Amino acid sequence: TRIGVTIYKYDDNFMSVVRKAIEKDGKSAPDVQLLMNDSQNDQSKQNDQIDVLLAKGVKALAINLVDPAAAGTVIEKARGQNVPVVFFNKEPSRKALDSYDKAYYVGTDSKESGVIQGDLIAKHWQANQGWDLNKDGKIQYVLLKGEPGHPDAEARTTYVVKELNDKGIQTEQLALDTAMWDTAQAKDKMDAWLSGPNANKIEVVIANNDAMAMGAVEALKAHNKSSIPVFGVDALPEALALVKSGAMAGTVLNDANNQAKATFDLAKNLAEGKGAADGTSWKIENKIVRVPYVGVDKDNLSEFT
Ligand SMILES: OC[C@H]1O[C@@H](O)[C@H](O)[C@@H](O)[C@@H]1O
Ligand SMILES: [Ca+2]
């Protein structure tokens, strides 16, 4: 069976571990041919790749959109040919999911990573009283946001502060800006914050993902401000190493392996005419499979590395 898969950007670091896990699953299954494509962060690039995949007779499509709003376009191309589409990681509109009977989504509940990240910061702030540099009881922080409009970026930006507040901890946002899920852009942005007027007031660096966290970690050691706690989201192998050295204070596992497994399992099922979850233990709720995030810090780190 031929399954065509598009990854919105191959050098997105979390999409790179998903991509690779998708490939290992496809190679262990002797009756499947996966046709992998890098959309290069361009939705028209992706749109033309879905035409070639359909021209090639694929039986199911697993699509990681560059734009969440291109879902309708992708469904209309798949529909003419009655082909299943499993959208994964960037969530389409509920109404776009509902417009096609064979459209499914594999993701996470975005909200939950922001809540867990807020609980990590609350636990380590209570425990590390010296992180309150100006001794006022409030967290003065900077936030590195992902793509504006992206469901994960927006929920993680909102729910980390809501959770801290809910856990009794008042916050003061010194600065927030997007570095668009990227290491080098977050390095620049942190360097700039550390070269500006409130470099001395920054107590906590909160980032919506690990690639950006790692960028802030190297702007922060360049200014020898290696003592500022940095939190991220995803539990990338490289970030677990920093959590281990203490250069980062915590992460949230974004489970690349089971989301890649669920995408593979539903796309092959649907490609073979079976029910989306047949023979699987995936719980599909309203065409959606949501995999859980897990909080990770020095105390439960041995479960991850
Ligand atoms: O859409 C891609 C993005 O999805 C998020 O869930 C991850 O945390 C990001 O690091 C990733 O780049
Ligand atoms: Ca403070």
Side-chain angles (χ1 to χ4, degrees), residues 1-263:
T1 185
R2 287 191 187 241
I3 295 169
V5 190
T6 64
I7 300 296
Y8 93 108
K9 193 181 176 195
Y10 265 31
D11 57 9
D12 176 276
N13 318 54
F14 174 74
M15 281 315 294
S16 170
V17 42
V18 176
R19 165 201 132 203
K20 287 174 165 60
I22 285 193
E23 290 172 319
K24 129 262 236 172
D25 302 321
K27 283 173 188 170
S28 50
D31 56 340
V32 170
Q33 183 187 4
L34 292 194
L35 310 185
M36 304 305 287
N37 277 143
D38 183 2
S39 310
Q40 298 177 338
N41 210 17
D42 196 320
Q43 190 55 60
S44 349
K45 240 75 160 292
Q46 192 168 87
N47 282 350
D48 303 333
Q49 293 171 322
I50 293 159
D51 296 320
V52 174
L53 284 174
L54 296 175
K56 303 214 204 302
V58 294
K59 300 300 176 213
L61 293 170
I63 303 313
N64 170 228
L65 297 157
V66 173
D67 191 346
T73 288
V74 179
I75 278 163
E76 292 316 324
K77 292 180 191 291
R79 141 139 56 210
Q81 185 126 343
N82 277 298
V83 159
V85 204
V86 186
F87 288 113
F88 60 108
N89 168 266
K90 296 217 204 176
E91 205 169 322
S93 167
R94 182 66 260 197
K95 312 160 197 191
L97 282 173
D98 296 344
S99 68
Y100 183 38
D101 226 277
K102 290 158 184 293
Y104 290 78
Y105 177 70
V106 176
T108 65
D109 171 18
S110 304
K111 266 202 55 161
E112 167 198 73
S113 51
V115 176
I116 300 185
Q117 204 194 37
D119 283 358
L120 285 182
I121 297 168
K123 167 185 172 179
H124 294 97
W125 181 255
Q126 331 284 1
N128 293 268
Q129 286 203 43
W131 288 356
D132 194 14
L133 304 186
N134 77 336
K135 304 180 100 302
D136 70 340
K138 297 169 60 170
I139 297 189
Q140 265 75 36
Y141 65 94
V142 289
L143 182 310
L144 285 165
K145 183 182 169 72
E147 289 160 318
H150 184 289
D152 281 323
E154 299 290 336
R156 293 174 181 162
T157 294
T158 307
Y159 284 89
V160 259
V161 179
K162 250 240 100 198
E163 188 60 23
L164 288 159
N165 288 181
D166 286 5
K167 292 269 94 150
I169 319 192
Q170 298 184 62
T171 53
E172 184 176 36
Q173 180 190 87
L174 289 191
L176 193 167
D177 194 5
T178 59
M180 299 197 252
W181 303 123
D182 182 76
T183 299
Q185 292 189 22
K187 191 186 189 146
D188 282 316
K189 201 68 51 50
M190 195 70 225
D191 177 58
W193 289 335
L194 298 176
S195 306
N198 59 233
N200 55 311
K201 294 138 81 185
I202 297 177
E203 303 178 344
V204 169
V205 182
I206 295 164
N208 289 178
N209 80 336
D210 290 339
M212 296 192 291
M214 293 184 307
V217 165
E218 49 194 296
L220 278 173
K221 74 180 64 277
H223 289 246
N224 303 99
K225 258 290 200 183
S226 19
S227 288
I228 303 294
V230 180
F231 295 82
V233 176
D234 290 341
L236 287 177
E238 299 73 45
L240 296 171
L242 297 190
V243 177
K244 184 187 171 203
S245 61
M248 276 180 66
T251 358
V252 191
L253 171 103
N254 189 338
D255 196 340
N257 264 19
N258 281 307
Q259 274 171 73
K261 227 292 153 286
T263 295

